[PDB]
Amino acid sequence: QTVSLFIWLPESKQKTLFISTKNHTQFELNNIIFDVTLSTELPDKEPNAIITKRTHPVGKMADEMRKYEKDHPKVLFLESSAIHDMMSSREEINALLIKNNIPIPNSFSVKSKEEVIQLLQSKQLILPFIVKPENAQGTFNAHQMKIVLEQEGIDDIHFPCLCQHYINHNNKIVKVFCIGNTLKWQTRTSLPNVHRCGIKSVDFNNQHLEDILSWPEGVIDKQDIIENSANRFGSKILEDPILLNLTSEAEMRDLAYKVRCALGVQLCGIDFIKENEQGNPLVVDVNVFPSYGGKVDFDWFVEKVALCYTE
Numbered sequence: 348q349t350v351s352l353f354i355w356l357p358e359s360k361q362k363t364l365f366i367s368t369k370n371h372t373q374f375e376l377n378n379i380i381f382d383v384t385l386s387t388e389l390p391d392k393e394p395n396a397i398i399t400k401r402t403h404p405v406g407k408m409a410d411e412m413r414k415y416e417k418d419h420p421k422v423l424f425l426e427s428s429a430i431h432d433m434m435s436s437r438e439e440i441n442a443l444l445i446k447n448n449i450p451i452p453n454s455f456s457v458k459s460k461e462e463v464i465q466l467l468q469s470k471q472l473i474l475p476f477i478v479k480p481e482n483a484q485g486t487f488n489a490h491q492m493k494i495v496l497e498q499e500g501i502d503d504i505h506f507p508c509l510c511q512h513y514i515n516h517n518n519k520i521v522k523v524f525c526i527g528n529t530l531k532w533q534t535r536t537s538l539p540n541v542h543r544c545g546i547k548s549v550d551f552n553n554q555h556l557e558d559i560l561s562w563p564e565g566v567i568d569k570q571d572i573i574e575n576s577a578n579r580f581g582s583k584i585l586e587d588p589i590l591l592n593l594t595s596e597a598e599m600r601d602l603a604y605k606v607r608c609a610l611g612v613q614l615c616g617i618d619f620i621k622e623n624e625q626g627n628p629l630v631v632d633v634n635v636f637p638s639y640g641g642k643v644d645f646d647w648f649v650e651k652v653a654l655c656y657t658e
């Protein structure tokens with residue numbers, strides 16, 4: 348039997364994702380011959396599956412994608428417009444995690460300051476909390492965060508947004524990348540533990556963590572400033588999370604399976620933290636068709652996609 352897989356990615360994503368690339372590649376896996384094509388444009392001939400990350404929620408690619416899906420219903424998308432749309436909403440992601448009993452820090456999708464005030468006044472939302480845009484993917488603004496340390500810190504929040512209780516997690520985050528059942532994981536630095544010293548809020552873009560160098564004195568412990576200032580608070584690789592006693596392989600596989608089932612996604616990245624590095628994983632982010640840690644082997648990627656396709 349033969350299966351055609353078509354990888355549809357712009358050069359920008361091809362460059363960040365792959366060490367190198369190939370046009371024609373054919374291989375056999377589990378008694379099936381896979382023909383894999385990579386292009387920046389949609390296929391002229393209908394394949395069995397299209398493997399794609401939609402660069403932006405709106406625009407030409409998004410439009411082409413929706414049209415193609417409608418007009419070629421037999422083509423499997425990894426991942427579809429519908430999955431990208433859901434994964435572009437922090438509300439929709441967290442609703443599915445909650446519905447599927449996957450621990451997260453306490454989270455509220457809010458539309459207004461009045462709503463935030465009521466959540467604070469009723470002791471539902473506990474300080475400090477991080478404010479994440481409702482839009483989750485495809486822009487610089489999607490990653491523009493505020494940490495609210497005191498009630499007065501709510502004044503300049505951009506709505507709609509997710510307000511999520513801030514967990515002091517000792518500046519370690521576990522990243523689990525999935526190609527279906529195939530996993531890759533790592534630990535990175537994250538954000539420092541924060542202190543409620545009187546400062547009302549601080550801001551950072553997750554793509555520009557050097558913002559943290561400018562936070563007022565007292566929010567971060569002096570020793571944490573010493574330990575992280577040399578790399579400008581950048582997202583730095585740490586030791587393997589099992590070796591660090593943060594998690595186990597079985598825990599990561601269980602969590603990743605639960606998230607994939609909850610969200611109906613095969614190609615994703617899951618970020619989780621633990622309060623004081625102990626207890627339940629707390630999922631803080633799920634991303635469609637992620638970085639996989641950057642610069643991955645092309646042949647590895649396509650074989651694992653083929654494996655996923657069979658399953």
Ligand SMILES: Nc1ncnc2c1ncn2[C@@H]1O[C@H](COP(=O)(O)OP(=O)(O)CP(=O)(O)O)[C@@H](O)[C@H]1O
Nearest residue numbers: 452477490511512513514537538553618631632634
């Ligand atoms: N509830 C929480 N408590 C403490 N820190 C949190 C947190 N939620 C997120 N963080 C920190 O903020 C960072 C950015 O949050 P998040 O991962 O949700 O945004 P994002 O979707 O912009 C990241 P990506 O670039 O991986 O998509 C995380 O990497 C983590 O360091």
Ligand SMILES: O=P(O)(O)O[C@H]1[C@H](O)[C@@H](O)[C@H](OP(=O)(O)O)[C@@H](OP(=O)(O)O)[C@H]1O
Nearest residue numbers: 360363402483484485486616634637638639
């Ligand atoms: O895999 P991690 O380390 O979690 O980071 C990814 C983010 O999670 C994605 O949201 C990025 O996509 P966008 O820049 O389109 O939002 C994505 O950008 P990319 O698709 O260009 O690689 C990555 O930065």
Ligand SMILES: [Mg+2]
Nearest residue numbers: 553618631632
């Ligand atoms: Mg993240």
Ligand SMILES: [Mg+2]
Nearest residue numbers: 483632633634
């Ligand atoms: Mg994200």
